Design a protein around this ligand. Sequence first.
Ligand code: GTP
Ligand code: GTP
Ligand code: GDP
Ligand code: GDP
Ligand code: MG
Ligand code: MG
Lengths: 432, 432, 430, 430
Amino acid sequence: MRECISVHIGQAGVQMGNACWELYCLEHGIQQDGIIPDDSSFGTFFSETGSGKHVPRAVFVDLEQTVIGEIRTGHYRSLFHPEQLITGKEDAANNYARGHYTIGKEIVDSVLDRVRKMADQCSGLQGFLIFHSFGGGTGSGFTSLLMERLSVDYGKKSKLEFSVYPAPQISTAVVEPYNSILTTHTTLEHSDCAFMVDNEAIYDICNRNLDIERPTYTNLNRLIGQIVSSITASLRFDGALNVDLTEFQTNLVPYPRIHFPLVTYSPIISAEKAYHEQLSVPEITNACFEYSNQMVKCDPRRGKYMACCLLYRGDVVPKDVNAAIATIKTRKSIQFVDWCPTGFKVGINYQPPTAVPGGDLAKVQRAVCMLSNTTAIAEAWARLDHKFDLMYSKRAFVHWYVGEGMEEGEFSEAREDMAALEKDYEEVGTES
Amino acid sequence: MRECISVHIGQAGVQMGNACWELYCLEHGIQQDGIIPDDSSFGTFFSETGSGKHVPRAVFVDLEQTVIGEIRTGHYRSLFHPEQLITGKEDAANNYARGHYTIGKEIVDSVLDRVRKMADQCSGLQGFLIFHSFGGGTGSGFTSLLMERLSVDYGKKSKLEFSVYPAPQISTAVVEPYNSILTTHTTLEHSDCAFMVDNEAIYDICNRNLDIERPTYTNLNRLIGQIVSSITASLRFDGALNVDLTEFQTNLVPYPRIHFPLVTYSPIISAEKAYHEQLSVPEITNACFEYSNQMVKCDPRRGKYMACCLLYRGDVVPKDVNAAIATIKTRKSIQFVDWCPTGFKVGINYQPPTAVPGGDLAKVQRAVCMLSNTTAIAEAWARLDHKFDLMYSKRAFVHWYVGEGMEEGEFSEAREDMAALEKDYEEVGTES
Amino acid sequence: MREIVHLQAGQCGNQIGAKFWEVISDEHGIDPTGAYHGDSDLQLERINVYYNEATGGKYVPRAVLVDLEPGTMDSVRSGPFGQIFRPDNFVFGQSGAGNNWAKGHYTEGAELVDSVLDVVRKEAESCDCLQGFQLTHSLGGGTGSGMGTLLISKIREEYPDRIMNTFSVVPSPKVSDTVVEPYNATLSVHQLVENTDETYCIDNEALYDICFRTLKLTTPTYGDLNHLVSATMSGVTTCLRFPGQLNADLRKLAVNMVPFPRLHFFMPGFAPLTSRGSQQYRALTVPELTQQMFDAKNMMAACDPRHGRYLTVAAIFRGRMSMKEVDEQMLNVQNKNSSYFVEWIPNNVKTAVCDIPPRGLKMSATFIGNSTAIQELFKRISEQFTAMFRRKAFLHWYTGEGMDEMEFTEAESNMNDLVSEYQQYQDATA
Amino acid sequence: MREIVHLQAGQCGNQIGAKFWEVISDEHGIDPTGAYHGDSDLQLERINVYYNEATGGKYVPRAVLVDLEPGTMDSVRSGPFGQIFRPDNFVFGQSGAGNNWAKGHYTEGAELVDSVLDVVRKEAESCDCLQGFQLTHSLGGGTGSGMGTLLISKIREEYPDRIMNTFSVVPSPKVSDTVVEPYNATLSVHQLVENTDETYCIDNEALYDICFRTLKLTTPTYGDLNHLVSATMSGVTTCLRFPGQLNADLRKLAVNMVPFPRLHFFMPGFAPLTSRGSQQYRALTVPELTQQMFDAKNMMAACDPRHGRYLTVAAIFRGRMSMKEVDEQMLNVQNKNSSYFVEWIPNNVKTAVCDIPPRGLKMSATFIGNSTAIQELFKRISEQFTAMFRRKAFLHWYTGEGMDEMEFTEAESNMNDLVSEYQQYQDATA
Ligand SMILES: Nc1nc2c(ncn2[C@@H]2O[C@H](COP(=O)(O)OP(=O)(O)OP(=O)(O)O)[C@@H](O)[C@H]2O)c(=O)[nH]1
Ligand SMILES: Nc1nc2c(ncn2[C@@H]2O[C@H](COP(=O)(O)OP(=O)(O)OP(=O)(O)O)[C@@H](O)[C@H]2O)c(=O)[nH]1
Ligand SMILES: Nc1nc2c(ncn2[C@@H]2O[C@H](COP(=O)(O)OP(=O)(O)O)[C@@H](O)[C@H]2O)c(=O)[nH]1
Ligand SMILES: Nc1nc2c(ncn2[C@@H]2O[C@H](COP(=O)(O)OP(=O)(O)O)[C@@H](O)[C@H]2O)c(=O)[nH]1
Ligand SMILES: [Mg+2]
Ligand SMILES: [Mg+2]
């Protein structure tokens, strides 16, 4: 009855999608194909056919064809609908203009068609889960192009997006500040709630708690896969206090332009050291509010919380959650904003987290994913804006963007909008 | 319900900890791991997990990583929580400044976190048991740094510490007088009661009563392990007259700055010569007040007693204790101070002392540990202060301490405080 | 005669409702398949109060299960006693409310309420003598708060003279399950103060204390809490279903418990409540049941009665008892705690004694209290609402569905009036 | 009617209390599970004095067990007759008193006394006719001395007219179990002289002599001593529970044993007490029981009566006896030892004879003595207190919890007044 349309754009989203759909297949008993050997649970993400083939309700799009071609040759080759896997001719070359103006104009009309064919096949539409990179290229340009198309064809339907936010120090491309601001400008009015994750932060977690000194991108994607499963667990599985995708909007978004919650997953613990831990509800819940465990390298205590969603799993007693949150409320270090006395949204689900074979996480009994909207993120946007100002003062790389359909005016408009956003964060952080 | 957080700092404390936790595991039936094969006794020192693993409630910290690394490779490797074993990069080089100012500043924030994670997991907090060396290095600098942090975060909670006091003649380092006074200055106002033991005194006991001419550090630690077990026996086991950790404070500390009781363990007897001894209560009790059996080389008869705590074990009849103490009170040689007519605190426990396999102590039926606060210790402090004056008159090694964060003023302040302490001992030793 | 029609709403209501019918079916001897297998014949005499008869002895609850999403109902029918319900009564949509009162009331439930009434009217018209409507919901969400209040307005406009009683789960003070509770609660209260005769306020936090203190329950699930709520729901409707020395109809309670029209918010309680290990240390007699019923630590609402005065109180006893003990004990409470009772009401206790107790208990008693101390709950909500509303915290979600800021001010003003009214009647004559 | 509510405190009180209920349950035929299996029906007639009835014949002690640490209570419930108690009555904290009166009274028990009274009042209100409160504690510690005296003040303020009797274990002169006994004792006495009607002082040293001299017991455990204390505790409350020729209520003793308000400290005794090998050399008759009761070597207090005079004396006999023998023997003691008795009191003996003796003994007798020689105990404590207080021995532990040096002076002054008062009334008329 419930459904979610997953669009995976770019290399980061596509590669993250493989981790996500490797986990959804595991949790639902699927066999790496559409076959379930000899139920209303899997219906949320998988469409069914008379032959017994369960087809993912996802669209893989990339102007580059290398990463999606790997899927067509990998273990999940027979899973996805061949037309869902859409590949372009040439990549965006880490340029926002190419993804949005030049190349995206030859693929958006094709991907939106498959979204149309998927939307009308659903008994009831619930929202969108968009996976993309904030660094640039297809994840910045094409996502903005596709997001605006959805906001017109599907309007008020929920549109959630998961983004790999640029790291403070680590960086893999030279023009990320240009692309990051450009996509932010064109997605504030078309996105309901965007969840942020940073490569640098998860590297620290994978080395600070998981005892692994050689994290790859595969390890990070699996950690991200668990978060999305926790978010969508309510639709897939029964629970004591269910939370829907449309609930995240009004719970975490106080104002339309401030919709960037952080992300956290508490029991990120190695198998060996899990034998010396109780892993009770109070300790995992307290772990969420520690800076050392955040998935985005932004210290929460630099600002005030304004919305927190605790999504529990497994053997969790609501009495423990009530007490656990109350003691957190008592602490003076964890400072919420004055205008939000009602700051916690609680979701409890009975299905425990499933460990992907060959993974690193332990066989945890109970897990909690925290989605916190904090004013501290304004500092990260300030850092990002500062990088843009330096490069743009010299017009460091503008000739590339201007030469592929874009105009100089967009740089001024894009940055001015971000300045307003930073100012908006200041207003919300003060009372009376 | 009761609990104790044990912090073992430095080589002496860590090595003493191995003896202590080898004995606690024995007394509670544990199998050198967290496993008890197919009870409210072990809860005081060990936390429990659903898997059946009992985790020590202790923190092993050392800036040097050699000794703690040995634990990670020894028989008790699987016992301790891996994060409890905290190791630094470089040692304190027998320098107080390094442990407190330079290196300790990069490990204290980590050890205190695990203390925070342990304190909040206890049903009720009772106190701290700190094991460290008085000689210098991590046992002098880091302990003072950690003790002051505890006095702020945990305030009025009991903070007991066990120290290996410098011997009168034997010495293993050249700058012990500097370190001993510096830690004493910064721990008087943050420590409730410190129990003293000397290497030289236990060497004599191990060769005067135990018939062993080759004592190692392993032998001494096992003797120290018994003392701590006797102190904490009341919490662990039932008894006729129980004594709590918070009781030692008001019973042995008449004035805030005089909180250095001596230590004694009466039936330190070899197995062979135990066949010719009755080992009745009166004789073991009388043995405590003999100079030949004190664990600290300070003759009690040079000064007056002001507080004694007799902690019995095994088959002990309170009638015998009443008579045994009374006859001691009669003796004129055992001189208590005038202002303490009420000088004895009696604790009787039913659990007999367990002999560690491969040890030297006999299978004694009943044992008594005496904790005596005596004015005679003032002479030992006077000797220690005298050594400091000689070296400091020439500024023997000040350039090392001053070059690692410390200042010259601390030497004057530290010694002036000790001079007041020696004067305070004189005031308490006189009446009218 | 005197039939009651049960109306579910939202996740909370459906969850409690499912437990409610498990309890009701138990005391009436109805199997999960609908068949009757009870021993006593008294439990079948007045079975028409909650059930409609079908061929072959099948008894169908007169219940309507509604929510904007299919999941909670799908869980209900799959769980025990889920097949007992009539399938036609599962009136549900597809796109749920996102915990905003506006969507469930104005946008999403507005297009579904018409279908719901088509089942309510059909159930109502099948009664020989309709007594009232029973609604189970929660004030902290969208569906229960929004859609539930919409149904209350529709039914009260269509059945003006029938008694409407609601069992609402109220937001707790200590901690929240939803960031927009003050908006949902204040708007919902604006509709209850006008279109219901008796609302039984209960908060999850209070029930946790009962499980922790009295029941000594170490793993309290939501099923455990719903049992406590179900117990009080059954207790207030026993005189309609079983004989007793002194009966008390639902309306009989409203007259004795509602002095003024808008002071109709009650905080319930139940007894006996003891742990498994402490049961062999209790006499289980009238004197001690009444001793804990008036205890502030045994009421399913957060508000402490000690902070205000009781306008009225009701004690519906169940089981064979000495009426002398009941009358004396009620008077004894009145005399000792005279400071806790409004003086211009000479008698503040209404007693009802039913002959048949709940299964497994020789004696039982349900406590209902209309106290001026309940203003603490409403005033606490008002403080939370004004703080958020003072700087347009989340109104774009509500105003985006069609609401207006004027409505929010009206809802807040009405809440303040109710709090003031409770304070006015807390003072003595002249 | 004439119910007694028992209140434990500290390790000493709980240890004695556990033995007390083992003795009481024995003479009333109560099994450790709470069931009654006695032979005589007289032991069930007045069982309400100490026990409350429950379904199935379970009889629950009207006892409240309290201590700041869980260990001693955990030992109590684990030991024999430990499950008989009601779990709700185990009111305990987590952080114990460190043997300092300040912590148990002002800092640690101050936040726990409110919970304790919630059980004391509940027990008290269940009595048909409350007679008094029975407290067992020790003066040498923190919990019993501190927390116990706090409860005494609270109850005496809440039940002014009920008789409060305390069984306190007093510090011994010969040797101590705690360095701060003088501080704890003097402060505790400052509260007893004002808020209790009869305190039975006992010291462990005296009980050791009884075990050594009379019982010839070579391995005396603390359980053995608690049996002696339990025996006298039972003896003073037999006329309430069993019939007799000449009854003596607890208040009946207080009037006859307390001439002036503050001279209400008693030193108890018991008889017969003989070893196993010397039992076949005793006649076991009234003349010899009275012969050892007044012996200074058979009293459970250190103070020798020979050093002062008896203001009053009570002899509660048990078992069938010749009242002529009792009256004559009491008079004979009066005549021979006329120098030991205050002259301005013409008669110094109060006699009570209960028909039913303790199990295993044909005859028994309990001795209670209000003697001016008890000032030796108080004056000895004062000397120890002033020596420590003269140079601030340990006050920083007490003053650190909130006490003041002014309070210590007040406590010392009151103690000196009591010692002086005992000396005043030791002299003849004019
Ligand atoms: N978390 C995570 N981030 C990734 C992963 N792969 C790429 N990224 C991020 O993606 C950012 C750059 O955008 P890309 O996804 O690599 O480029 P694109 O979206 O494929 O667009 P093109 O440049 O046309 O290829 C880098 O800075 C990475 O941080 C991944 O597997 N996991
Ligand atoms: N009883 C006992 N004492 C020890 C033992 N090991 C070291 N000590 C004492 O520790 C004193 C010196 O302090 P150490 O512990 O060696 O130095 P540290 O604490 O590791 O600090 P660093 O100098 O930085 O290494 C010596 O004088 C020894 O008497 C031991 O195993 N048993
Ligand atoms: N006792 C109980 N309370 C519930 C249950 N589900 C939700 N609640 C309560 O309902 C409130 C959340 O509102 P909810 O009913 O889920 O939103 P709605 O679905 O739009 O009506 C919280 O205060 C929860 O405590 C349940 O199964 N049992
Ligand atoms: N008979 C008996 N006396 C005890 C026992 N434990 C302690 N005492 C007495 O109690 C006094 C010590 O005070 P204590 O009760 O331990 O301190 P508290 O725990 O703060 O109340 C001493 O005089 C002991 O003789 C026991 O188990 N049996
Ligand atoms: Mg690419
Ligand atoms: Mg070292």
